[PDB]
DNA sequence: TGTGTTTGGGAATCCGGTGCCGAGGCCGCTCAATTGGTCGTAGACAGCTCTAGCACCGCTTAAACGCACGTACGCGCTGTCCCCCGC
DNA sequence: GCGGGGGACAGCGCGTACGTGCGTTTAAGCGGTGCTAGAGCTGTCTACGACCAATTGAGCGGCCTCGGCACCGGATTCCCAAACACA
């Protein structure tokens, strides 16, 4: 029995979050998470060629918000950033 | 062996394009078209396959022959 | 009776939209499928979800292309599709040379 | 013991986005905040899709989402759409479209 | 006096320029143009020399690429005059926005 | 000073050279309109995308690196200026 | 000793591809065969378009080779037009072609 | 500052190709470009290729694959045969 | 000869029953996330140099602009013939 | 496979809009000067992230249930295509 990974948990408790009284199908749930994983994989690769760019060898916030803006269109690129903003924010401002 | 793509499987095709009407000597170029992409994407699957020395060509080496062309395919484990 | 001609052509159009299924008949296409790779590598197998996302990127790109062509067509002030809008198409889209 | 996603206020997994993030090769290092960062944005954008595809869900009387509704949501956001332009959705159909030409008089 | 016929001169200037490869646009106008843009981004922007360059050499080249596809709808439709509804009609095929 | 009005030095005579360029032999009246909308737009969408590449630097000048890193990451990769 | 270049008989500088494999993360080990294999393809690469290039300077009476030759011969060959296909070239120009139609009868 | 850059080995190339044709400034910068970005696409794709077989060397093998990935028909035929003949001739010595 | 309204009739849609299988929940387990602590160094910051971007001016001439003039191409109209469509 | 009707294609006319050419105006291009903002490089030191051992609970596999959805038949409705009314 091999380790499998997925976002199935996770997607299902932003749907609660979203729509409560409404559920999401088997094939639904593999085609989110193969979307989750792929914008994953562009933030990822966008956030590496930042860093790489200005000959930099760690990935901060920083990267990952100008790769945000790069890939996103305009209006959500802006409250993308204002969500992970607020998030970090909330995450260092705690301890 | 091409010919399996019946004229009215290109018709349904051509159907849900929004196409009204068709005419005659469609199907032999659409044939045409569709062969060389299937050739073009099972080309980089079997290559994959090749490389992992596995004999079976799997669902995943389809999605990375398609996302090599920049067609991505979501809902086969992506 | 008898139907207005194009009309059928329609009701096919709006059906065939608001479904989702595939249009391809699965096993002449499995069939042809197994044909080609023959030719790249011999005695392969194929997990049956290999050739059924293969059939899947087939008819998404043929429905596009013929979204592009219906254009084309559209374009010349015609409303029968023909090889040559097929041609010019592909040739924007920068498949054919 | 709390988890660095409950820390942050999210509920997207901070710890394995990270994990991800140092085993996939994308740099020597990876910052604290990265990986809050990059769940959050995933999180934000997992719940604009699943807002728009629960709405076409209940547009349709269904109750859940099938892949039909998330490509029904995708091409219908213009932002969504521009993101996701060169992605095909495994049973999504199309949008219903005929060209204005093509109607009879 | 003398006159020539209309279209003479077209195929001529046809030849002079897809013959030479000197830019076409007048390049301290398109400065003002790309300087007046990223004004809407950031105030306050310098720019090399050598990126206004690069930016004047890739849209002359877009711009090209669109009007050869322009002229092939435009032929496709019968017609010799390239019309806005050719240009239209090529980036919605070509998939830009 | 202010920047204004700039898009109408792309000249009607500028706009017939691109199209000679592209083998095209004649030109209708409307089109130097429509062509230098699709130029204003397709000038945005690489300008931003530098601006952002300078912004991350902190630098306050787009260089050239920039705006062929912008091309290429919108898949139009440009030779002759470095990278 | 000898360069790895030199043991392999080629010109381009095989250390120099093998540094620059370990220094791109693009994995965490590097077979040995690896940059000879790559620089092998790159000179060969670089050695056709060049021999194209040539022929199509030496066909304008030009001893050099310049941005508008390489366009000439890579919009020529069929196989390098469809690799460096999405690929402008700065002063590159375009092909002399003038359709059928627009000429007169 | 260093500065990388492949001219003398185009220069070289060219020299073995055509030995006396020169080359402008201009096109040995296109020409630079156009070394680097092929050889980006090519380790590029042989990462991708050793990260999704869970394999963690990148061998003369991925380069190969790589190099059938990207290249067209008879250029990918003979820049195999090429890159097969530098391997042998290297390990040979 | 022409404009306009109406009806049988196939085709898509709604509604109720039903049944069935996958989605959602629960449990046991394990392994990956968390805590705490050490240590090395990546980069943030200050600070310093020099280049190359910006603003200006003057002059020449080549290009842009306006306008006259003519013709040739786009577009509408008519006809026919044939080749896709509906069954 | 067949009947037929609409659309593709051919031919014609016309009228205005686009190409060609000429004279005038304008601003692009080139050179030359000067200023300074900011890019690029260097030294420090410090906070921040990698590494490791131990803890544990969150998540994953496996089972089980039932309700949401698929399907079927029957009734409702909705365009359509003649079809004749009647001016």
Redesign the pocket.
Known sequence: ??????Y???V?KVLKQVHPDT?????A?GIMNSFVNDIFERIAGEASRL?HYNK???I?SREIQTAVRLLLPGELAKHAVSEGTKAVTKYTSAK | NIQGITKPAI?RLARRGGV??????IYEETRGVLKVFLENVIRDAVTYTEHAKRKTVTAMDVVYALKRQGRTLYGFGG | ????????????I??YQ?STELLIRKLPFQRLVREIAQDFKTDLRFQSSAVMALQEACEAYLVGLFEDTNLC?IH?????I?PKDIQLARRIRGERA | ???????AGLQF????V??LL?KGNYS???????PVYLAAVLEYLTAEILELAGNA?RDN????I?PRHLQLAIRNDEELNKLLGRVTIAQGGVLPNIQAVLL?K
């Open positions: 029995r091999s380790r499998k990974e997925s199935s948990i996770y299902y559920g999401i199908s088997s094939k749930m860093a930099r060898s760690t901060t | 018709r009204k009407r068709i005419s005659g000597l | 009776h008898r139907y207005r001609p194009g009309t059928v052509a329609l009701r096919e709006r059906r608001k067509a010349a002030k015609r409303v029968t023909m | 013991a709390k988890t660095r996603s409950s820390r997994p901070v710890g394995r990270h994990r140092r020597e290092r990876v910052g604290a905040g990265a869900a009387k269904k109750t859940r099938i009879p």
